[PDB]
């Protein structure tokens, strides 16, 4: 039964955990927004082989996932969970957190995302051969940018995305429930103080993040089936573990 003091302390603890593991500073992402891919560069990306484009993406995604794992390690209560629960939560949630975090690198004004040192539109990703998945992620990032998340709001929300007592395979289901509930109290308290509880009904529907992650895994299957050597040889081991079927 966490007190108001303890709840306020959880708010600060979560926000600090996030701040220390946010990968790129928001200031930098914003200052880089004028740095956009030239038409020559865009053409170059579209002319890239499918294998090279997937391999690049797998690397960047793995990098982003590593910061999420670190976020989890610093998140109050997570390391107190049993090793099996930690895995279940991260295996199901890491990519979901990355997708939420990604909205920070999305510029809604010109519909671009920060990728490989510059900003680029969705036409940059043609060579992957999953235009639907790409458009879906771009749309999702657009939906989220409209909410104008603060860094603190991202911290609290992504903590909840990770700490989900409804993930299949949890041993200490009740210990995860208790952590989830306290993080919800932390989130709702933070929102009430800043008069931002309106965003709660505007957050992604209960199966949207699940859908995007399933789509990703599926498009990887289409890729991997046709290019099985490259995945074995050059893709990050962690990436295969999380996504290869």
């Amino acid at each position: 039964y966490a007190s108001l003091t303890e709840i306020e302390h959880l708010v600060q603890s979560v926000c600090k955990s996030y701040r220390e593991t946010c990968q790129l500073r928001l200031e930098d992402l914003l200052r880089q927004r004028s740095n956009i891919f030239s038409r020559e560069e865009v053409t170059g990306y579209q002319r890239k082989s499918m294998w090279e484009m997937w391999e690049r993406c797998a690397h960047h995604l793995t990098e982003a996932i590593q910061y999420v794992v670190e976020f989890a390690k610093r998140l109050s209560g997570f390391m107190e969970l049993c090793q099996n629960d930690q895995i279940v939560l991260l295996k199901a949630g890491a990519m979901e957190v990355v997708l939420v975090r990604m909205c920070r690198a999305y510029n809604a004004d010109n519909r671009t995302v920060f990728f490989e040192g510059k900003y680029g539109g969705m036409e940059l990703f043609r060579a992957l051969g999953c235009s639907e998945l790409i458009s879906s992620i771009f749309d999702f990032s657009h939906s989220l940018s409209a909410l104008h998340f603060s860094e603190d709001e991202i911290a609290l929300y992504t903590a909840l995305v990770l700490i989900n007592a409804h993930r299949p395979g949890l041993q200490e289901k009740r210990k995860v429930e208790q952590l989830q509930y306290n993080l919800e109290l932390a989130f709702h308290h933070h929102l009430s103080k800043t008069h931002r509880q309106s965003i709660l009904a505007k957050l992604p529907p209960k199966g949207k993040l699940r859908s995007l992650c399933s789509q990703h895994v599926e498009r990887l299957q289409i890729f991997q089936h046709l290019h099985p050597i490259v995945v074995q040889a050059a893709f990050p081991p962690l990436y295969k573990e999380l996504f290869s079927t």
Partner: peptide, 8 residues
């Protein structure tokens, strides 16, 4: 799993 190793 590699997640185990990363968690330490």
């Amino acid at each position: 799993t590699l997640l185990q190793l990363l968690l330490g």
